[PDB]
Amino acid sequence: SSTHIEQFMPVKLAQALANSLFPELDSQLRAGRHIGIDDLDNHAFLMDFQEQLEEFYARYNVELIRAPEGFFYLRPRSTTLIPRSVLSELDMMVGKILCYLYLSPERLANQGIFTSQELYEELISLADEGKLMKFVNQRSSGSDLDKQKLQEKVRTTLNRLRRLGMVYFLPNNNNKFTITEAVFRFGADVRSGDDPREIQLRMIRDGEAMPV
Template identity: 60%
Template sequence: MQLHDAQAPSDYLPSDLARAIANPLFPQIDALLRSGRHISSDDFQFHQFLSDAYDALDLFYRRYQVELIKAPEGFYYLRPKSTALIGTSMLSELDMLVGKVLCYMYLSPERLANEGVFTQLELLEELSNLADETQLLRMVNQRSGGSDLDKQKLKDKVKGSLRRLKRLGMLTFIAGVEKFSLNESVFRFGADVRTDEDPRAVQLRLIQSGEAIVHDADLPQADALQNNQDSDNEEQLGLEV
């Protein structure tokens, strides 16, 4: 039996896609995107690669029933369809709410005044000011009576949300974990504010009305993730927000 010579990628792939896949950066970028990572202009080299190879890679990922999205703000991420061949995981209600509040903070004048740096304390204060405390505490304990223990648990859960959003490329910790800067990809939580209205006002309305929180029907895996949300492996699969 005669074996045929191995074909080069360019023999059966479009040349622009073959070049993209052959690039030494591709394996790392592909792994990051599949893990749910958002690639913003802060990741200059990766961002430039995706910008140059976008058309070819968009067709590549569509074969997996996944879209390579370039958001209006310029960051890239994978958005799976219901038939996706790449696994997905879901963020919890608290993760979603923290993301919405971070987007609100990103739009604030304080971001410029603070050179883009916020503290965890400032985030907790914004959460308390913008969202109903009872609702927040019930995300930690459905039977919460507002005890100091429940409030401490909420603080711990918010820190966990920050760690998850950091792994998704939405923020960067500074000098430990008490301070962080926000990346443009936090606008993944701001799709609702892309209107002619003042974006900060729209985001505030969504948070205060509870519309910033995803309903159970939109989070079919939320309970499973909530039970394991302190695991280091939560973002091993693609993000679906």
């Protein structure tokens, strides 16, 4: 009959969109924030009405995607109604390193709580110090001023990732943080045991990762 919700929208989708949690979750998602198991309320909300939200967001030409690790996010399409952006290469370095720390048992004593200094030390341990520094400044040759510049850049990238939900600052401390499973996306190019050059094409075709 008329004046009846099923005329325009499914009942469960309307119930989900009328829930008190919908607005904060939608604003965060459109901002690019990933959702992990830690946000128990938001994660459960996404799980319960997961299908309604993928079909709703499809209207924006963006896929609400749940990675096998269990974290939801948004991937815009080429015809996205919501703009799209790509992380910096330094952001990739810090995200890969963050995934390593999530999987690294040596730092188990930290119990998941990490400081930016430790992250930088691990980054320089695994990466090429000076050749990575080259991107921070084209004229760097190990100068300690440029060293501090790279430290500051790493801190800034860490803050941006915090904005993306890959990392949480502690309820009182902004100098310490706890990693989230979302960081696993930084390894999507290696989660499959195949040739790297074919997986990169598969991902870029899927829209997962553009090149630089």
